[PDB]
Amino acid sequence: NVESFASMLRHSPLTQMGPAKDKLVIGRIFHIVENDLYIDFGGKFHCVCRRPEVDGEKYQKGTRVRLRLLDLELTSRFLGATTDTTVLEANAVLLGIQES
Amino acid sequence: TKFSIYPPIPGEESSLRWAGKKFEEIPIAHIKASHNNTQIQVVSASNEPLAFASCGTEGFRNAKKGTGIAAQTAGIAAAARAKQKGVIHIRVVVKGLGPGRLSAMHGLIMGGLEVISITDNTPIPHNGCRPRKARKL
Amino acid sequence: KHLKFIARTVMVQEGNVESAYRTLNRILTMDGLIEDIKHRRYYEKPCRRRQRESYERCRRIYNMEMARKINFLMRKNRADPWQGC
Amino acid sequence: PRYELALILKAMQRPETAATLKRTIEALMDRGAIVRDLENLGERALPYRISAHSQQHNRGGYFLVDFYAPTAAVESMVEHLSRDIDVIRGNIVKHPLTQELKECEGIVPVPLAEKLYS
Amino acid sequence: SNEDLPISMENPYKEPLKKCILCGKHVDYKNVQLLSQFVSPFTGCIYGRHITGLCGKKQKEITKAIKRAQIMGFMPVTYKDPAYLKDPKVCNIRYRE
């Protein structure tokens, strides 16, 4: 008796999230390049958010933050492009640090 | 107060005044800016001509009439002649896209007149008569 | 026949005649009246007018698509996060 | 069918306007129209100067005569409104209430690229 | 064969189409106040759909109503009626300064 893939997909938190628009998620800053923070939130792609002007130094690698998701994958189809063009990153708004 | 670019509506009493006169009574400076000439005429609110000027009347002739300086001179002369009759504030009604379209107004400013409103009355035919064929140049 | 000093009329604010004239010119340009007069100076033959309108529509569509593409791609215009690789 | 006559009448005294309205409705009835209703939108300045019967008008009274009439009557009615003097202007339209509102569900989007080749 | 398999149905999360502001409302030529909202205050030019944000059907209806009102003495042609200069601004255009 082993759980099937269908059951895992049905009960996955990402599946329960429904649409990713304006959803509240908890992400982790796994990389910092100057004032750009790369946050993984359990999705396929991370998201790049600018360091906030207030308490910016309080954000470091591993800091847990709250994000308002706009889209898991940023894709667009241009004129004559047979396939969608993606930037391999998500679109989210950095609300701020999350405290347990 | 809050300034509104929209002109005051005739028949409605507005607080705006100029020399104790209402907007409906301010004299009218008609400007026509052709490509070869520019004409300026001040009239009263009752359509009484008070002053007239043009590039040709100011001595400029042929191509020299098309310059903006000629329109500025015409505006200066028209403003002087109107001010001789007591004109102080004017409502500018400009038509045509001649080079002097703006310069004439400057002349009026240089002439001593005060412009309180700028109106465009360029004759734009809503698909009227057929204009001449394009120049083969 | 219409009432006068309503259409294409701008009130001069504190004697700033130049600013009022600029606003009036911008209003006419936004409404396309200036271009209308310029095109109506000489007759534009119907085939020429149709060609020009089609070209303008195609140019606007292409410009909008290119602007969208540039805005989409400029999101990646940031510091290299994996320098040295 | 159901027609609506938009009638701009010369700004006159109330008895004159009553006489003009009665005459116009009488003409409509003579041509065969069953007048459903008569409305008044008030007396107001015209949006532009209108010249009619060698006279220029700046103000007028607005009325709407809703009625039913045989089609062949409508043209005749127009002619009558042309020959009346107190009528600044008169236009008979198909009644808008006979034009049902086929509900729009929304604006269906279309990709912009195809517009170049389509 | 198993309950966990996905089922076929219309997208339940599908948000409704953003109907035009006049959708479901009867545009009339006698309603000069509504019609004037879509014309240029300084020239009376009818605004395009990219300015009014109206759907094609409603844009055509507004245009036809405006033309009918203009030709039937209900609406000024060369300018917006000054009595309606303070109506709610629905068109996406900015003129002054």
Ligand code: FES
């Ligand atoms: S969006 Fe449906 S009627 Fe315009």
